């Protein structure tokens, strides 16, 4: 018997939008420590991991661990019937091939009850060696998404390069070429819309912008985003879900060596 309520159900809406276009089915692992999701897209180029921990919820309860397999498009369609002010409760029996989503207006006598049919999944967790990255660029989220969307119009691939003083995104195509140079905010120390870099090692790598512009569906979740990069390893784009945990997109580089 699983029950999770959020007074601020906006977050659930945002997650599903951040996900629905990159992946279409995924298995939501529920346990008493909270909610966990790891699924790959159709071309196994990108991987997403979602952690919402139990303490973030206003009400959490998980008698027996669950792996519920969820059509994410179905789920987003339902979640678009919730208001941003709505209080959202998730409920599912031990077995039950169904998930209930309940949405209540804080401040009106309106209550919505949706029963989402689940699906038989069984994915198989990949394992994510946890490690140190040559570069970690923390910047504003709107900005990263502006950069990804603009350079799309130049080319199909972006080359991201990092040293101690800033990062640069480059791209090429029929049109021409272009480079955007972002520099470490020297204001910093206690600033909000900054750019800060943990370079240990110059990196320079190359990713498809298609997947990057899927990741920036996550923008509404946090004012700020981080890119972790190292020589021969997928890139991590991370959005912190204030007070609950995080969404991490992982992306396999383009390479010829």
């Amino acid at each position: 018997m699983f029950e999770a309520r959020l007074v601020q159900g906006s977050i659930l809406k945002k997650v599903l939008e951040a996900l629905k276009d990159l992946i279409n089915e995924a298995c939501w692992d529920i346990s008493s420590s909270g909610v966990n999701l790891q699924s790959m897209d159709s071309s196994h180029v990108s991987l997403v991991q979602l952690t919402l921990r139990s303490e973030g919820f206003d009400t959490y309860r998980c008698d027996r661990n669950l792996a519920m397999g969820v059509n994410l498009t179905s789920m987003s369609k339902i979640l678009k019937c919730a208001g941003n002010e709505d209080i959202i409760t998730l409920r599912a029996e031990d077995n039950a091939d169904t998930l209930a989503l309940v949405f209540e207006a804080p401040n009106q006598e309106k209550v919505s009850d949706y029963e989402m049919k689940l699906m038989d999944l069984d994915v198989e967790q990949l394992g994510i060696p946890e490690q140190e990255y040559s570069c970690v660029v923390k910047m504003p989220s709107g900005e990263f998404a502006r950069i990804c969307r603009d350079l799309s119009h130049i080319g199909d691939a972006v080359v991201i390069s990092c040293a101690k003083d800033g990062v640069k995104f480059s791209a090429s195509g029929e049109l021409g070429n272009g480079n955007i140079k972002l520099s470490q905010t020297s204001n910093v120390d206690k600033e909000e819309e900054a750019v800060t870099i943990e370079m240990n090692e110059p990196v320079q790598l190359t990713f498809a912008l298609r997947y990057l512009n899927f990741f920036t569906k996550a923008t509404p979740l946090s004012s700020t985003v981080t890119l972790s990069m190292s020589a021969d390893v997928p890139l991590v784009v991370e959005y912190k879900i204030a007070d609950m945990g995080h969404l991490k997109y992982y992306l396999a580089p383009k390479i010829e060596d």
Partner: peptide, 16 residues
């Protein structure tokens, strides 16, 4: 062009 796209599986493997 300039390269080719790796998969996420070439880097992350089934859970020990």
């Amino acid at each position: 062009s300039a390269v080719l796209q790796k998969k996420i599986t070439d880097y992350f493997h089934p859970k020990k």
